[PDB]
Write a protein that binds this ligand. Structure first.
Ligand SMILES: Nc1nc2c(ncn2[C@@H]2O[C@H](COP(=O)(O)OP(=O)(O)O)[C@@H](O)[C@H]2O)c(=O)[nH]1
Ligand SMILES: [Mg+2]
Ligand SMILES: [Zn+2]
Lengths: 204, 38
């Protein structure tokens, strides 16, 4: 038997959930289609200092555009990612809804909040605005699916919570699709400096 | 120590061949996607 976790990947349509999970090349080529739910399960293997961990990532077929997701999608989820678009303020305002929809079925499973598309210059949702994770004591990460920026951070955090081992490390990065856009290393350092500053600012 | 050294599926459980969710022995269908216990 293998150590695998069902990871539900939720968020508004157009936030980049499918682009994100597709970065993991073997998860993409070995994804499984669930006809009854219209879902694709990407087996995302990660290799830790204590062995392989497989995140079976559930990705929608775009049904989130027309309403909430059915129970079956959430059932037995052991962890989750809530994604939003840093270029669409409205997607950030729906994070609480997705959070509620998720906890209504799965209770206090580990959750990571991800703001996608940080490779874009015209960033609308800045670090100072992102506060929901602090209210619910969740972990947040900037990411850019199309540049593989911080791709492994959410999965590393989840694995540590799920295993109960804060010293857990990925010994090697999974084979990822080549970056389709460049992520200015400085812009990444500036965004990372904006998060730590925002982390040391009071909640309004 | 490795997880696999101390990891074991609950007695009677079965992984769903369609969506990989782990189900109880008594369940004839998958509690997530409704597929049948193969
Ligand atoms: N610049 C940039 N564009 C992205 C990124 N991720 C997705 N896009 C685009 O956002 C649109 C929606 O992508 P998709 O993965 O289908 O979002 P989903 O509805 O949540 O599955 C598409 O046009 C993507 O090409 C990113 O990380 N950076
Ligand atoms: Mg999609
Ligand atoms: Zn199933």
């Amino acid at each position: 038997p293998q150590v695998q976790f069902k990871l539900v990947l939720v968020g508004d349509g157009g936030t980049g959930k499918t682009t994100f999970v597709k970065r993991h090349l073997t998860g993409e080529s070995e994804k499984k289609y669930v006809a009854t739910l219209g879902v694709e399960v990407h087996p995302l293997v990660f290799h830790t200092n204590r062995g392989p961990i497989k995140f079976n990532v559930w990705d929608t077929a775009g049904q989130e555009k027309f309403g909430g997701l059915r129970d079956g999608y959430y059932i037995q989820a052991q962890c989750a990612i809530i994604m939003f678009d840093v270029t669409s303020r409205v997607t950030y305002k729906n994070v609480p809804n997705w959070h509620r929809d998720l906890v209504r079925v799965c209770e206090n499973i580990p959750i990571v909040l991800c703001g996608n598309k940080v490779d874009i210059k015209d960033r609308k949702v800045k670090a100072k605005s992102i506060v929901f994770h602090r209210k619910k004591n969740l972990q947040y990460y900037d990411i850019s699916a199309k540049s593989n920026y911080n791709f492994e951070k959410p999965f590393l955090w989840l694995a540590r919570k799920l295993i109960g081992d804060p010293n857990l490390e990925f010994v090697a990065m999974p084979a990822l699709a080549p970056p389709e856009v460049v992520m200015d290393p400085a812009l990444a350092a500036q965004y990372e400096h904006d998060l730590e500053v925002a982390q040391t600012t009071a909640l309004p | 120590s490795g997880f696999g050294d101390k990891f074991k599926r609950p007695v009677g459980s079965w992984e769903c061949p369609v969506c990989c969710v782990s189900n109880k022995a008594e369940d004839s269908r998958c509690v997530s996607c409704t597929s049948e216990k193969p």
